[PDB]
Design a protein around this ligand. Sequence first.
Ligand SMILES: NC(=O)c1ccc(Oc2ccc3c(=O)[nH][nH]c(=O)c3c2)cc1
Ligand SMILES: NC(=O)c1ccc(Oc2ccc3c(=O)[nH][nH]c(=O)c3c2)cc1
Lengths: 198, 196
Amino acid sequence: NLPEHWTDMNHQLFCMVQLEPGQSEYNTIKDKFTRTCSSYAIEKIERIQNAFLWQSYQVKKRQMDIKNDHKNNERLLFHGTDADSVPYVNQHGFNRSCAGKNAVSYGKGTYFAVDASYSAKDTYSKPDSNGRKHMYVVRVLTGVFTKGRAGLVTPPPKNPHNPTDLFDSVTNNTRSPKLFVVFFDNQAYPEYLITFTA
Amino acid sequence: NLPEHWTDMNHQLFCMVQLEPGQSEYNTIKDKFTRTCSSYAIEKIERIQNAFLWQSYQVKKRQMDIKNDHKNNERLLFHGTDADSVPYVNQHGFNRSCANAVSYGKGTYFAVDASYSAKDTYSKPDSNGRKHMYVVRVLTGVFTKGRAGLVTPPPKNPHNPTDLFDSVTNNTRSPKLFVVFFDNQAYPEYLITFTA
Ligand SMILES: NC(=O)c1ccc(Oc2ccc3c(=O)[nH][nH]c(=O)c3c2)cc1
Ligand SMILES: NC(=O)c1ccc(Oc2ccc3c(=O)[nH][nH]c(=O)c3c2)cc1
C-alpha cells in the first residue's frame, strides 16, 4: 500500500523527510515554486509520509477514477498556511471546518492555488515569529469542476433534477483555473512542506 | 470486502434493498427500534448498500483499531432526519457542514435511543406523516465530554495537541448521544420509514 520511494518508518505511522537539493524530487518542487515566487528563498522541503492520510486519499482517488472513468482527476497545487496549523495538517490533513473565508469566496471549503505566488502571500503563508513562511504542495482530487459560488458547503450538482450527483470541486474560472475548493475530508494529500523566507 | 449479508448489485456500486418482514435481518433491526419506539408504526426497512461509503468507512475502522490497539471502536446508533436529506445521506453519508442545537460541538449527532431520534425536530414528518431514521455504524472509539464550539474532538492530553479523542458525548459514564467531526466515521446501514 505505501509508496516504495518512502523511507522505512519501521511500524511508525508518520514521518517528515528532509529532501536534498540536487535530487530530482527537491529540484522539481523548487522549480514549481520558483516558476512564480523567485523573490522568496527556500529554507527546506520536507516529504510528508502520513500512512493513514495516504490510504484514505488513495481510496478516494480510486473511487473518483472509477466514477469519472477518464483518470485526469488529480492536480498538484499549493496551500499557504500559518505555523500554528502545520502540526494539525501534517497529522490530520485539510479540515474545511478550520478554513478561513477567502478574499474571493467560491464556497466554504479548503482552497488550493495553481501558482505558488498566491500561496506565498502573508494572508495565507503567515510569517512566524522568525520570519519563516509555510506552503504545502498537495495532491488534490479536482476531478470534474465548475465555477463555484460563496454559498456552497458542498460542490453543486451537475444536474438540478439529480441533486446528489455532484461536481468533485469548484474553481474561480473553468477556462483559466487559478484556485480549487474541495469540500470533503481526504480529497487532498499534503505531499511536501516548503519552509521559505524573504 | 462487501459484507456477505448484502445482496447481489448486478455490478452497481449503490442500491437501497427493502428488507423482507419476518426474516432474521429485519427482526434484528426492528427490535433495536421497538426497544424504545414500540408505539410507532414501521412502514419499511431498507439496507443501504453503498460500496464507496463502506470502503471509506472500513478504512477508517482499520485505522482506528490500529491507533487505539483494540476492536471496541464501533457502536450502532440512530439518526433522524428530514425526507429532503435522505438521498444525500444514502449516497454521501453524514456531513457536518449541512448541520438543530450543536451544544456538544459542530459535528454529526447520533442517539443511543431510537426514541430521541423519533422526535419530530430530527425525523421531521413529510406531507403524508412519514418519518425517517437511520441505523448507523459509528466509530465512537475513545470519547470525552463535548462542549459548544468544538470543530474536532479535544486532544487526549494538551501535551500532544494532535492526538485527539475519536468522538464526544453528553455524558462519558452514561452516554445518550455521540458527535463525530470527520467524513467516513459513520456508515448509514439501515433506513427505517415509520409513522406515529
Ligand atoms: N491557501 C492558499 O495558499 C491559497 C492562495 C491563493 C488562493 O487563491 C488564488 C486567487 C487568485 C489566483 C490568481 O489570480 N492567479 N493564480 C493563483 O494561483 C490564484 C490563487 C487560494 C488559496
Ligand atoms: N439527529 C438525531 O437523530 C439525534 C437526535 C437526538 C440526539 O440527542 C439525544 C439527546 C438526548 C438523549 C437522551 O436524553 N436520551 N437518549 C437519547 O438517545 C438522546 C439523544 C442526537 C441526534
